[PDB]
RNA sequence: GCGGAUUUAGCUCAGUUGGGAGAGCGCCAGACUGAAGAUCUGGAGGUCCUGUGUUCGAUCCACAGAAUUCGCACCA
């Protein structure tokens, strides 16, 4: 691309989460055309979010997509999050990369099974912030109801473990603003005010060796193969050379380009969820839950010894012990993988709540080095969250 | 990113919509012939692709995965 992308204010990159039906998809359109004015940005709509044909006529946004838009003091990345039930995985990533998110909830039904899911998978993963923002408040005119349901919101927040007293609420519509009517417009930013006064600044790696999470792959016809995500340190200055680490046998690459929203650049540091381009690289070679790096900074393996917390069901776990062979899956930064347990000679089974020390062997290799955090969900729900502690692989 | 379909002995394939699995061939024997092969007669041989949940009990259900494939989408 020949734009340019010209650094100014830090870049805080967020997303829209929670229940179905209710929001989310169109109150970002919203925010992104709001904002193509009251601080002259370049918006885009629905049509354009949602652009995928099955979300189009399923009428109910599958995979996330991103979208940016800016304010005086900070810049934005938005991910749009699907709500069904169906894709929290798809989400899951989407969200595990965001710096704060919007958390969208409906003034008419109120709290919902996919906005608790949401909410916990948020404290889960790692999210340090969230903005709540009342949706559809052009449905319901008694201003009493708004009391109740928002010291709802609250409540259930608080109970996942998170701010929610001191928890910033707009009160808004957004087809409304997304419409033009101005009294809610002005609600839009009301919340694109707090993504600055609440963020508050991320802190940047960047002295230390880069690494890239690969989290989507795209085949551009001008260029060649290109792939985004969340830089997790350092930087890529391109022309540089890469290394395209586990899951496939190890690539050798040289960065070839660093756009930032089809704007070009040439570099991309730490927190800027950004495309590489990769020469030599087809579409078929690279894949999400791959990472960029330093050449030499890092190795893919397969085995490795944990020490791992088994949340209770009192944290939505098991509730019945788990025994050699149990195999749930592994999720190491933009991705999981099922591996298999073998316990310690001297322990026969892991009660939910339990803590123990397990080697795991992974159907796939992955970068990993000693200490990496991970989380392991099986069936539906988190089974609990433990780090390598000595790979063996 | 989203959907279908198939996985049952070494090979080819039936079977059960929860009660604890077969044929043929190929494999190991005794039988006939100097012996091959044919063929007769006997046995051995399955984590029913994997893990969980439910259940008194799961090869089949549920929730999570794998390998093949076959269609769709998307495009810094
Ligand atoms: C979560 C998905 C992927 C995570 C991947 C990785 O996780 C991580 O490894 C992470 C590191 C800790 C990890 O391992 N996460 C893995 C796990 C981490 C878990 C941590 C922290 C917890 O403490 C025990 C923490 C949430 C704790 O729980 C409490 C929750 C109680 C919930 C009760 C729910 C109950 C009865 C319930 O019926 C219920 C519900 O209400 C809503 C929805 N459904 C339900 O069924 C409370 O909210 C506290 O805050 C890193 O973040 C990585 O970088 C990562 C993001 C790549
Ligand atoms: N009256 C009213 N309707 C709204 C409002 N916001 C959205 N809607 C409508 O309700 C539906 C919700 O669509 P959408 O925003 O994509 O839902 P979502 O929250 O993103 N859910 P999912 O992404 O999981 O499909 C649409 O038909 C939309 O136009 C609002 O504030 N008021
Ligand atoms: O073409 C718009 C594009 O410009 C960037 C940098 O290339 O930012 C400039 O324009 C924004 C819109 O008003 C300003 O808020 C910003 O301060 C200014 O540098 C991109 O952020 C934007 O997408
Ligand atoms: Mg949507």
Same mark, same amino acid.
């Given at each position: 691309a020949k734009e340019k992308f010209e650094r100014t204010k830090p870049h805080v990159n967020v997303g829209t989460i929670g229940?179905?039906?209710?929001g989310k998809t169109t109150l970002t359109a919203a925010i992104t055309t709001v904002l193509?004015?009251?601080?002259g940005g370049a918006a885009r709509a629905f049509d354009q979010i949602d652009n995928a044909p099955e979300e189009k006529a399923r009428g109910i946004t599958i995979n996330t997509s991103h979208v940016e838009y800016d304010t005086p003091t900070r810049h934005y990345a938005h991910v749009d999050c699907p709500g069904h039930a169906d894709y929290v995985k798809n989400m899951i990533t989407g969200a595990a990369?965001? *710096? #704060?998110?919007?958390?969208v909830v409906a003034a008419? *039904? #109120?709290?919902?099974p996919q906005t608790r899911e949401h909410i916990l998978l948020g404290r889960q993963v790692g999210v340090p912030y969230i903005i709540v923002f009342l949706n559809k408040?052009?449905?319901?005119?008694?201003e009493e109801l708004l009391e109740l349901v928002e010291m709802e919101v609250r409540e259930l927040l608080s109970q996942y473990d998170f701010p929610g007293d001191d928890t910033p609420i707009v009160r808004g519509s957004a087809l409304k603003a997304l419409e033009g009517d101005a009294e809610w417009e002005a609600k839009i930013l009301e919340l694109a005010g707090f993504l600055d006064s609440y963020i508050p600044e991320p802190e940047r790696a960047i002295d230390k060796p880069f690494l890239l999470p690969i989290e989507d792959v795209f085949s551009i016809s001008g260029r060649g193969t290109v792939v985004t995500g969340r830089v997790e340190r350092g930087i890529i200055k391109v022309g540089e050379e890469v290394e395209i680490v586990g899951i496939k046998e190890t690539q050798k690459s040289t960065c070839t380009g660093v756009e930032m929203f089809r704007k070009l650049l040439d570099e991309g540091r730490a927190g800027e969820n950004v495309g590489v381009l990769l020469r030599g690289?087809?579409?078929?070679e690279i894949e999400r839950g791959q990472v960029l790096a330093k050449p030499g900074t890092i190795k893919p393996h397969t085995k490795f010894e944990s020490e791992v917390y088994i949340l209770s069901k009192d944290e939505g776990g098991r509730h019945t012990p788990f025994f050699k062979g149990y195999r749930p899956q592994f999720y190491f930064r933009t991705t999981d993988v099922t591996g298999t347990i073998e316990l310690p000679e001297g322990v026969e089974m892991v009660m939910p709540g339990d803590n123990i020390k397990m080697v795991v062997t992974l159907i796939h290799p992955i970068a990993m080095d000693d200490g990496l955090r991970f989380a392991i969900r099986e069936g539906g729900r988190t089974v609990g969250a433990g780090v390598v502690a000595k790979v063996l692989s």
């Open positions: 229940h179905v039906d209710h193509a004015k009251t601080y990369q965001m *710096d #704060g998110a919007i958390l008419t *039904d #109120g709290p919902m408040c052009d449905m319901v005119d008694d690289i087809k579409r078929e």
